[PDB]
């Protein structure tokens, strides 16, 4: 159980350290991670695709 929680921390870390996202986009993604952990992967993927699309 502690292992699964630790794994959950990873998505939070990644999304927290995506530099091309807005504050509102980042906060929204984090809130998604809190409200539905089973969607973690999905959320992360979406976040990634946004962070790439808004690259300089």
């Amino acid at each position: 159980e502690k292992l699964m929680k630790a794994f959950q921390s990873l998505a939070f870390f990644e999304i927290l350290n995506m530099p091309n996202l807005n504050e509102a986009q980042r906060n929204g993604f984090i809130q998604s991670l809190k409200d539905d952990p089973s969607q973690s992967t999905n959320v992360l993927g979406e976040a990634k695709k946004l962070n790439e699309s808004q690259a300089p």
């Binding site: 502690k2 292992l3 630790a6 921390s9 990873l10």
Partner: protein
Amino acid sequence: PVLTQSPSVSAAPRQRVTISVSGSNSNIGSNTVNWIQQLPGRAPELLMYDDDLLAPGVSDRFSGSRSGTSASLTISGLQSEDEADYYAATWDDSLNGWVFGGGTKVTVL
């Protein structure tokens, strides 16, 4: 950062290095610590959890510890592939969420 990690460290191969992190009784003082390995352009990797337990597949050269409001990660027989940024993570009861350190760069000469 809520958690304060140790400064960057450079060591030769086969040396043993220990990175540390300090917090409060609202996080480290009351919750176990996780350690994350971050390589450039790669997804972060879970190295340790529950203070001293190794994630599946992680080399036993990594060891962890927690006492009081501080924790540390020890890497024995340092290797070139150990060069990376290491981050500490834990739960904070005051913030009711995850808190992370600023990271510590480990450079292998």
